[model samples]
Target chain A: AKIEDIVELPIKGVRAVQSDGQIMFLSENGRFVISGQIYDLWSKKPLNTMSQMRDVAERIHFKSMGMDVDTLNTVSMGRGDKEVVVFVDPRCAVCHQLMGDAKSLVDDYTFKFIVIPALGAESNRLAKNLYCAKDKTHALDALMNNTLGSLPSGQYDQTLLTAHFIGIEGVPFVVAPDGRVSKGRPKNLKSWLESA
Target chain B: AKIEDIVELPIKGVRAVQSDGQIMFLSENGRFVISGQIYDLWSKKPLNTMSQMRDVAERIHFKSMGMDVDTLNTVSMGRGDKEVVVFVDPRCAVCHQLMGDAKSLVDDYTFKFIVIPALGAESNRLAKNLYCAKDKTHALDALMNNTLGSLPSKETCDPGQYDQTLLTAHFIGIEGVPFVVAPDGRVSKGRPKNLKSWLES
Candidate 1:
């Protein structure tokens, strides 16, 4: 569970370490550690291209740590083919503004809003109501408009845990279809979606 | 002269390089370079202790780069054994206050004031008058009191090289006047809250 020792690797700012028979990479300062594969962006291959490590380096789509979009309880909106995943707090005024601004792009992108309850107990209570409502989409609209009333409490641990793992420090956290992540309301949402 | 190339040394944050056949040490970020001997403080020996380099690394008292204390034209004050070097601008009020406060401790420390003329044209003219006066010690007092007048401008009496003094202060990394450097090279910028303690420390 704890790092044993850190030894330098050939790379400039990286270190290699072994703990409990598992090899991991660490930043030179030792503040960050990565257990998964590291790719050489220029080479488009795993960092360790040695024949002995090839089996472990087989190409795989890298997913956000412990975050599965299909499993998240989201209030789906829009009819567009492109999906924009958003994490929001019901009591967050900026989140409401971001959602309202995002409506104009609904024809081009579908926004899946997931409640993060980052604003403490009031947000937790309101998020639970939105999650347990029979009509989640209508409930989400009412919640953003500050008109939704209390509903029976429901389980929200899975969504909360996913947000924690993904390091959602504040709401209006948006993930575009091509995987560009933005914190807070982006300065220009339509152009941000069109950017490469 | 331009640096040729920088190559890493065995040390973590140091690099070794050769420019025009002279070896020098550089910081990892390549911002600083030193051609002098670097000592390992713990062992009190040169960082490079190889037999071939030992002759070049014999112990020597390090002096501030290109700064010779005896050569500086200073308005000397005090009679104490300990020396405190200070750089000041003639028009700087904080420097005047620091000088006034330092007089109380003159019995235990000597303050050598070097005029840097950092506060533009008026400071340059006043500093030139102070440097040219026959009674430099009295002139400095009158200068700080804001009553010093222009002398007949006698060859500046071996001073008046305020530009050179300013360059020396810059080389020593003094960004502003009231800059103090102790006998042991500890430096303080602006007027220190406790001058006596700062000098002693």
Candidate 2:
């Protein structure tokens, strides 16, 4: 039999591989090929193997998928050894809340913000304005405060596409340095930064 | 480099095959291997492969694990080519409701009722008593009506068969009492909200 194709799941040490319409898990360096359910034993609930895979996949490719401040029309806040990458929508209230909550963490961690026009009309307008601003970083700051600078030639939508490719499900989808993903602002912003 | 172990998932065409601790999928004839998420595309939600596997496994093994009214002390009502197998706990109110509502379906579908002591202490007591009763079918009828007939036998009774049935239920992941396994092995929990329509379907 001829070999067909290989694909990686976003999970560690697991793959959702297939060929000829049959799919299964390839584990232990191909030593054992088993088809069965892996359960949480405690919850008696089946684990979402696909989502776990997606998370890990995002983490593995994370470092290379950096948010270029110039290209993504992103801005940075804070200054430290640890950093968090989050996709923010211009009109997102939670994104603004997160900014205020994490303001004190400026001394502890650097934040990478990426523009994603996930919200409708107004958000899309702000992202483009920030993209074409003479000072992209300052424009980002103003945009976060519901202000829009001059419009010029730019496609901030590309940044949104990259965010989608990275599998960002929601705004304030923060990625800690260790690759743990926290959706929305976690309860303790300072502790999150310190730990991250 | 050496091949190790293989396990089959409950899914029809998929397997969670393991080799040297790196788990993934392989083609039927070992022709190819690939890994990725399979989705409904329409829902845009990741498919729960494990649950799907569990459901199918339950469906396929369902017939082979039929409930015998004799050893199990089950009560069978109605007779036909179409049947529904349900696990019921004596203490479950929903089970009581379902039995009362569907009682009229005796002319159509055969309802295979397996007593599982999943609801707690009283349910176990009720099951053993009904099992040891001389008139088991009638005993079940009375038990459903909140009445217990003769006391459990002083005879050295073996409750292992009933215990096995309950174990099978948990293994199949039937989370609640009054769990129905349709003729084609479709598993559903709770009462048939739409009495007439559900029975007909």
Per-model TM-score versus the true fold: 0.39, 0.43
**Whole-model Cα lDDT of every candidate shown, in order:** 0.61, 0.60
Chain A of model 2 scored by TM-score: 0.65
Please tell me which predicted candidate would have the highest TM-score against the true structure: 2
- Per-residue C-alpha lDDT of model 2 across residues A1-196, encoded as one tens digit per residue: 3323333221223444444434456432332233543342222334345553344444423544343444565877878788777778888888888877666777878887777788866778888777677776676577667776454444348877766654567887887866677788788876775564
lDDT of prediction 2: 0.60
Interface-residue RMSD per candidate? 19.6, 16.4
**Model 1, span A1-196: residue lDDT tens:** 3322222211133343445544454434432233444333323444332331332222112242324565665787888998888888888889898889888988999988887677777777777677678877677677669665555344455677766643455788887776667777889888887774
Single-chain TM-score of chain A, each candidate: 0.67, 0.65
Question: Model 1: per-residue lDDT, tens digit, B113-173?
Answer: 8877788988777776765666654766775776556544565265434467677666434
True contacts kept of 1: 0.00
lDDT of 2 by residue, B1-201 (tens): 322323322222334344443444533323233444433222223434555434333443354445343355477877676777777887887888888766778776788788888877777777777766655546657757867535546466656534666776665456787888677666667776675576455
Listed for each candidate, the true contacts retained, as a fraction, are 0.00, 0.00
